[PDB]
Amino acid sequence: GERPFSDIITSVRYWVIHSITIPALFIAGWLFVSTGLAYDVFGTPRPDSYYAQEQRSIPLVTDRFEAKQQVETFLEQLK
């Protein structure tokens, strides 16, 4: 019932739309990482946030129900 992708993607209308939305989405994803927002949304350490300066033991979660607080505490221990 609908048009073949090969018609749609060889049309000017398609390229006019997508020459703008493709770069736009690409640049939004670039900035998501380049501004560091990706770190904070997901809670992923930056290269300087795996360990506090002197320690070498990993912040493993050890308590099911205050795992949330344990992580909060580990995060404060990075000064």
């Binding site: 090969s6 018609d7 993607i9 060889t10 049309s11």
Partner: protein, 40 residues
């Protein structure tokens, strides 16, 4: 801007798209050797 198919030949779309892929994947490989993940 017509919806008519065939105006931008399929062979050129496929060439340009494929070149785009080679570029993005090549950048990924370059990153295997620089910055994070590079072992250095």
């Amino acid at each position: 801007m017509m919806s008519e198919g065939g105006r931008i030949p399929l062979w050129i779309v496929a060439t340009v798209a494929g070149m785009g892929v080679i570029v993005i994947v090549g950048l990924f490989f370059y990153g295997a050797y620089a910055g994070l993940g590079s072992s250095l």
